[model samples]
Target: AASLVGELQALDAEYQNLANQEEARFNEERAQADAARQALAQNEQVYNELSQRAQRLQAEANTRFYKSQYQELASKYEDALKKLEAEMEQQKAVISDFEKIQALRAGNL
Candidate 1:
């Protein structure tokens, strides 16, 4: 828990840093009096708002992949993967369930 305290804080600042960085550029562009590129900063910041969930989730999944921590947000997908990984290692084949998960992965992928 103590080790992870810095982890969250570090990433927290990173997100803030990301937003602040763009807004900094936004200020510069707006002051530059470039109408077209000011339009650039306006939507660029909004795009970060709309699209950052994907970046966050991708980072979450990678953390799960490496850290093996089952935080509430990531546990669902990570445990699902663990369950799928579990099935393949059993001694006897699970004809019905095995194919189902396989087909699920295949279809999903």
Candidate 2:
């Protein structure tokens, strides 16, 4: 009976260690997710501003001789946003994975 109790305690310690590691991983992943979300938000805002600039340029182009270069800039800004979106998706996946691991660890306990 003492040996069995010892084994159970050992298992508990192991479980705690795993849980701690999992928590650390989760914290790191969460921080990265927050950063990525902020970057994505900033990128979206820039894209919106570029779109407005493009519209203004288009309006001016209707009566002006210089061709508005704003459309090209808008397209490039949108492409950058797409890249950021993809990065955000990847960060989301990392967070999801961490959540799953945490759940599994909790369930085991």
Candidate 3:
């Protein structure tokens, strides 16, 4: 009876040690999972900021391109108007010269 009691006590001590080790492993795994969650949250914040900045840059670039196109078209329209005015002035001068030559010939006759 005395030997049996000693053997049971030794087995109980071994079981307690294994239980403590299992608890420690569980706590370590829980801490690692918490750290991974924090990292994922921080990464999401950075991604949102970068996405907003990229969207704003694209909007500004589109506005600049549209303004440049409008300016180019305005300049082209002004140049065409000036050319038409000059052509009309040249036609007027030619007609006046023809009339002057005809009047001089009639006067000489």
Candidate 4:
């Protein structure tokens, strides 16, 4: 009976030690999983920020491109308007001179 009791106590001690080891390993793996989750969250935030910055830069580039195009066209339009006005003035002067010459010919006749 004494030997049996001794063997039973030994087996109980072995089981306790194994339980402690498994608990320690579980805690360690749990901490590693938590750290991996934190790293993943940080990477996602960085990716989102970069994506927004890229979109803003693309919008600014498009704005500048269209602004330059508008300025170029406006300049051309102003130049054409000035040329048309000058041509109209020249035609008016020529018509006035022709009318005066006709009046003088009629008076002499």
What pairs collide in candidate 1?
none
- Please list all clashing residue pairs in model 3, or write none if there are none: none
- In model 3, the Cα lDDT at residue 36 comes to 49
Model 4's lDDT to the true fold? 0.60
- RMSD value for candidate 3: 42.2
TM-score of each: 0.29, 0.57, 0.43, 0.44
In model 3, state the lDDT of residue 15. Answer: 99
Sorted by lDDT, highest first, which candidate order results?
2, 4, 3, 1
Model 1: per-residue Cα lDDT over 1-101, one tens digit each: 99899999999999999989976865554444344344445544544553454346556765565544434445454445445444333312333344455
Model 3 per-residue lDDT tens digits across residues 42-97: 54555455445544554464467576655555555456545645554554454455
Q: What local lDDT score does residue 7 receive in model 2, on the 0 to 100 scale?
A: 100
Which pairs, if any, clash in model 4?
none
lDDT of each: 0.53, 0.70, 0.59, 0.60
Candidate 4 local lDDT, 77-101, one digit each (tens): 4565456455545544554555555
- Which of 1 and 4 is the better model by TM-score? 4
Look at candidate 2 and tell me the lDDT of residue 107: 100
Predictions: Cα RMSD each: 28.2, 4.4, 42.2, 42.0
